[PDB]
């Protein structure tokens, strides 16, 4: 058996931006109150309170190319 | 058997940005209170309180190319 | 058996950014209060309180190329 | 005569505020013209002209408790 | 005569503020003109012209407790 | 006659403020002109012209407790 | 012949402005694309492309007096 | 011959403005596409493309007095 | 012949401005693309591409008096 696997990729993924700005992200600028009395936990607790895991993501490009070349004989 | 795995990549993934800026991230500028009374824990506790794990990510490009070349025989 | 594995890569992953700046990150500029009374813990406690693990990441490029070449005979 | 004056005060006066801001006070940004000719004052003059006695008052709390305990025999 | 004057105070006056800011006070950014001709004053003059006695007051708390304990026999 | 004057004070006046800032006070950034011709004053003159007695007061607490204990026999 | 040319000018051209501001001029914040193929020019070319010759003019007065005194004998 | 040319001008041209502001001018925030193929120009070309010659003119006065005094003998 | 040319000018051109500011000029903050293929020019080319000859002019007065005195005998 003869197999030729010769894909050719000449693609452009392109982004052009004049200006990118004046971006405001303000998570949890408010008021958070947690009051707990006489609670019973028989098993594990994970607790997050406040302003956690917030992201501001401002890439000047942020382009993605995902490319799988799989040959199975 | 003859296998010729010869993929060719000439791709461009490209970003052009003139200016990128005036970015504000203010997580947990607020007021947080946790009051706890007579709580009972019989197994492990993880607690995170306040402003944790917040990210400001401003890459000038931030482009990604993900590229898998797999041959199975 | 003959296997020729000759993938060819001439790609570019490219960023051009004119200016990148005026970036403000202020985690936990607020007010945080934790009050605990008569608590019972029978097993491990992990506690993080305040402003922890916050990130400012401003790379002039920040491009990624991920490229896996696997041949399995 | 026996007098017992035994009031007990356990009160809370409480204020909780997440964030307080972006406050603009601009007294007398306008145009003020006073033109006086041949006036006669036989008695005292007080004159205030322009932008006087303006207040910006931004307390983070600003709570008031006023409490009079008067016993007259 | 027996007088027992035993008022008991356990009060709290409390303020909790996460963030307090971005406060602008601009008295008399305008234009003021006073033109006076041939005026006659037979008695005292007080004159204030322009931007006087203006206050910016931004206390992080600013709470007041006023408390009078009067016994008159 | 027996007077027992035993007022008991356990009070707190309390402020908690996370951050306090970005405060701008600009009195008399304007234009002031006073023009006087042929005026006659027969008695005392007080004159203030321009930007006088303006206050910026930004205490981190600024709490007041006023407490008068008067016994009159 | 006697010619007496005695024009008298006591005029006032006057502007009084309290405050002048918050002026935004943003020419060419948009996107401009010029694509040219196989064009033939036998004589001179002037080309302007983009954001050119734009003016922001904010004079605090900006008054004009134009005054011609012509005597022809 | 006797000619007396004795015009007297005592005029006021006057402007009073309290405040002048919050002015936004945004020429060419849109999208401009010019596509040219196989065009033939036998003679001179002037081309302007984009956001050109735009004016924001915000005078605090902007008064004009135009005044010709012409005597012909 | 007697010619008396005695024009008398006592004029004022006057500006009073309290405050002048917060002026933003942003020409060509957008994205400009010029693409040229196989063009032929037989005579001179002037080309301006981008953000050229833009003006911000904010004089505190900016008044003009233009005054021509011509006597022709």
Nearest to F9 by CA among F66, F62, F72, F58: F66
Q: How many angstroms separate the first and last alpha carbons of chain E?
A: 10
Cβ-contact E65, F64 below 8 angstroms: yes
Q: How many angstroms separate the first and last alpha carbons of chain H?
A: 10
Which residues face G33 on adjacent strands?
H33, I33
CA distance C3 to B9: 20
Contact residues on chain B for F19, CB-CB shorter than 8 A: 29
Cβ-contact G52, H27 below 8 angstroms: no
Residues in chain F: 73
Q: How far is CA B35 from the centre of its chain?
A: 33
Return the number of other C-beta atoms located less than 10 Å from residue D52's C-beta. Answer: 22
Helices (H), H2-61: none
Residue E23's SS3 state is strand
Q: State how far residue E10 is from chain C, nearest Cα, in angstroms.
A: 19
Q: This structure's resolution (angstroms)?
A: 2.8
Chain breaks in chain B (C to N over 2.5 A) after: none
Both tokens of B49, joined, read: 């309180």
Largest CA distance in chain I: 75
Nearest to E67 by CA among F66, A12, G51: F66
Residues whose CB falls within 8 Å of the CB of residue G31, separated by 6 or more in sequence, listed in order? A18, H30, H31, H32, I30, I31, I32
Distances from the Cα of H40 to the Cαs of C25, G40, H46, I20, in angstroms?
Answer: 56, 5, 14, 51
> Please, what is the Cα angle at I24 between I20 and I25, to 5 degrees?
125
Residue F47's SS3 state is strand
Exposure class string for H7-27: b at 16+ Cβ within 10 A, else e: eebeeebebebbbbeebebbb
Both tokens of I11, joined, read: 């004029």
Residues whose CB falls within 8 Å of the CB of residue H9, separated by 6 or more in sequence, listed in order? G7, G8, G9, G10, G11, H67
Q: Do chains B and E touch (3 or more CB pairs under 8 A)?
A: yes
CA distance F52 to G1: 65
The strand pair at E64-72 and F64-72 is best described as parallel
Provide Rg for chain I, Cα atoms.
25
Q: Test G18 with E33 for CB contact under 8 angstroms.
A: no
The DSSP H or E segment spanning E8 is: strand E8-9
**Partner H contacted by I20 (CB < 8 A):** yes
Q: State how far residue A30 is from chain E, nearest Cα, in angstroms.
A: 8
The strand pair at B45-52 and A45-52 is best described as parallel
Distances from the Cα of I61 to the Cαs of E31, F42, I20, in angstroms?
Answer: 14, 40, 10
Cβ-contact B52, A52 below 8 angstroms: yes
Cβ-contact G28, H48 below 8 angstroms: no
**Partner I contacted by F50 (CB < 8 A):** no
Distances from the Cα of F6 to the Cαs of E3, E70, F3, H24, in angstroms?
Answer: 11, 12, 9, 69
Q: How far is CA I31 from the centre of its chain?
A: 27
Sign of the CA dihedral C6, C7, C8, C14?
A: negative
Both tokens of C30, joined, read: 């607020």
Most D CBs within 10 Å: which of G15, G17, G18, as the mutation test of the D interface?
G18
Residue for token pair 């402005």: G17
Rounded (to 5) percent helix, strand, coil in chain E: 0, 65, 35
Q: State how far residue E22 is from chain C, nearest Cα, in angstroms.
A: 14
Residue for token pair 């452009």: A12
**Partner B contacted by F14 (CB < 8 A):** no
CA distance E56 to E25: 7
Return the number of other C-beta atoms located less than 10 Å from residue B46's C-beta. Answer: 14
Q: Test A29 with D16 for CB contact under 8 angstroms.
A: no
Name the structure determination technique. Answer: cryo-EM
Both tokens of C34, joined, read: 């934790």
Distances from the Cα of E65 to the Cαs of D54, E14, F43, in angstroms?
Answer: 25, 11, 45
Nearest to B5 by CA among I47, A16, C5: C5
Residues whose CB falls within 8 Å of the CB of residue A59, separated by 6 or more in sequence, listed in order? B15, B57, B58, B59, B61, B62, B63, C62
Both tokens of D35, joined, read: 């033109």
CA distance B58 to A25: 13
B9 CB-side CA count, 13 A: 22
Q: State how far residue B9 is from chain A, nearest Cα, in angstroms.
A: 5
Both tokens of G61, joined, read: 């007065």
Contact residues on chain F for I18, CB-CB shorter than 8 A: 29-31
**Partner C contacted by A28 (CB < 8 A):** yes
The strand pair at G2-5 and H2-5 is best described as parallel
Q: Test I55 with G58 for CB contact under 8 angstroms.
A: no
Both tokens of B47, joined, read: 């607690």
Residue for token pair 């064009």: G39
């Amino acid at each position: 058996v003869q197999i030729v696997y010769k894909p050719v990729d000449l693609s452009k993924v392109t982004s052009k931006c004049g200006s990118l700005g004046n971006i405001h992200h303000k998570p949890g600028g408010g008021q958070v109150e947690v009051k707990s009395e006489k609670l019973d936990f028989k098993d594990r607790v994970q607790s997050k309170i406040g302003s956690l895991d917030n992201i501001t993501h401002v890439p000047g490009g942020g382009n993605k190319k995902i490319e799988t070349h799989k040959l199975t004989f």
